[PDB]
Amino acid sequence: KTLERNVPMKEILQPLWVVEPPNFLRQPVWK
Amino acid sequence: GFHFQQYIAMAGRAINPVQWTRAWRRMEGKSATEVYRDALAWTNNQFAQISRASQYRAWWWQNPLGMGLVLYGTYKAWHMIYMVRKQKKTAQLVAAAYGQGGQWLNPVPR
Amino acid sequence: PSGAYRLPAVDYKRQLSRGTLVEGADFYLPTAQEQQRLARHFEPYSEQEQEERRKFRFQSISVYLA
Numbered sequence: 001k002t003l004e005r006n007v008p009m010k011e012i013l014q015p016l017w018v019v020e021p022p023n024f025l026r027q028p029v030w031k
Numbered sequence: 032g033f034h035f036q037q038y039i040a041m042a043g044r045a046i047n048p049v050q051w052t053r054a055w056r057r058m059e060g061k062s063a064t065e066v067y068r069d070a071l072a073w074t075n076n077q078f079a080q081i082s083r084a085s086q087y088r089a090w091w092w093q094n095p096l097g098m099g100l101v102l103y104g105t106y107k108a109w110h111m112i113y114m115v116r117k118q119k120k121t122a123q124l125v126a127a128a129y130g131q132g133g134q135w136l137n138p139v140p141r
Numbered sequence: 142p143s144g145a146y147r148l149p150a151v152d153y154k155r156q157l158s159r160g161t162l163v164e165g166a167d168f169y170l171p172t173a174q175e176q177q178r179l180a181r182h183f184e185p186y187s188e189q190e191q192e193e194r195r196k197f198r199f200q201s202i203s204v205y206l207a
């Protein structure tokens with residue numbers, strides 16, 4: 001069977017989350 | 032930094048009233064959380080494109096200071112377009128209300 | 142004074158002569174669950190704790206903004 005659907009790139013390449021920084025402690029700021 | 036031309040084009044579409052009706056129709060069956068998440072995802076996609084593509088690719092504006100010069104130019108453009116315009120208006124306001132330099136006048140002597 | 146309300150400590154020189162002084166751990170770990178994490182090697186965190194920690198992989202710029 002042939003491919004006809006228009007495949008977007010978001011289904012393939014997922015971007016990393018960089019807008020809000022990482023929390024290596026995995027704990028909230030008040031804690 | 033990248034896609035400044037696309038950003039100008041986005042602003043032009045936003046200021047177009049036909050696009051306001053288009054957005055009105057697109058807002059049917061839609062939530063504020065969804066809109067906010069979409070915008071945040073768009074911004075993240077931009078910054079992630081930068082973080083990834085800077086490792087191997089160089090734009091036409093590449094220079095020994097890198098993207099620092101582009102970001103400085105963005106800041107300077109914003110400053111001269113918005114803040115200096117506001118300063119002009121404030122200057123004319125103060126000059127009509129008190130005279131030139133009226134906001135820095137000394138208190139009335141007692 | 143009686144001695145009931147005396148100073149609840151001994152000077153560092155006398156401890157050093159007694160062989161008793163400890164210098165370390167500006168910080169501490171209150172709970173044994175938190176103390177034995179690096180020695181367990183197989184469950185440093187329980188499963189419930191793991192899924193609770195997975196909620197804080199990033200800081201919340203939304204909450205910061207609000």
Ligand SMILES: CCCCCCCCCCCCCCCCCC(=O)OC[C@H](COP(=O)([O-])OCC(O)COP(=O)([O-])OC[C@@H](COC(=O)CCCCCCCCCCCCCCCCC)OC(=O)CCCCCCCCCCCCCCCCC)OC(=O)CCCCCCCCCCCCCCCCC
Pocket residue numbers: 033034035036037039091092101103104105107108111
């Ligand atoms: C006036 C300048 C001073 C501004 C005010 C003072 C502010 C000072 C602060 C400066 C801070 C700068 C901001 C830095 C942030 C980063 C911006 C950025 O790099 O991307 C810019 C952006 C490119 O974004 P991009 O993501 O890199 O996309 C590239 C494309 O894929 C296209 O791919 P490409 O490979 O085909 O081309 C890549 C690029 C290549 O660009 C270059 O390499 C430079 C071009 C030639 C080399 C020499 C450059 C300098 C002298 C010639 C150019 C004079 C204009 C000065 C332009 C400043 C930038 C060098 O092409 C351009 O971007 C065109 C730029 C030249 C526009 C010429 C317009 C002519 C009308 C103006 C009259 C003539 C000048 C009057 C005298 C002004 C003297 C100050 O350029 C645009 O403005 C987009 C234009 C879209 C068309 C809009 C409709 C036409 C209107 C034209 C005016 C455009 C607005 C700028 C006004 C300048 C003319 C008044």
Ligand SMILES: CCCCCCCCCCCCCCCCCC(=O)OC[C@H](COP(=O)([O-])OCC(O)COP(=O)([O-])OC[C@@H](COC(=O)CCCCCCCCCCCCCCCCC)OC(=O)CCCCCCCCCCCCCCCCC)OC(=O)CCCCCCCCCCCCCCCCC
Pocket residue numbers: 023027028029030196197199200201202204205
């Ligand atoms: C004008 C300021 C007025 C106050 C003076 C300022 C004093 C504070 C200075 C702080 C300066 C720090 C610098 C900014 C931090 C930046 C980074 C950051 O915050 O990370 C993201 C971080 C997000 O946290 P996360 O790690 O993602 O955790 C998210 C969890 O998923 C969330 O889930 P969860 O499980 O954690 O809990 C959910 C929820 C709620 O928690 C729950 O689990 C449920 C329980 C909630 C119920 C009770 C609510 C709390 C108490 C009531 C609060 C409101 C009204 C009080 C009314 C009184 C009674 C009627 O969480 C919260 O509500 C978070 C608590 C927010 C408290 C702030 C964080 C503690 C910082 C220590 C500040 C020191 C103050 C001293 C304390 C007072 C004396 C002991 O942001 C924050 O949450 C904190 C907000 C920052 C406050 C805004 C202050 C402005 C900062 C200016 C900086 C820019 C400087 C230049 C200005 C010029 C610009 C052009």
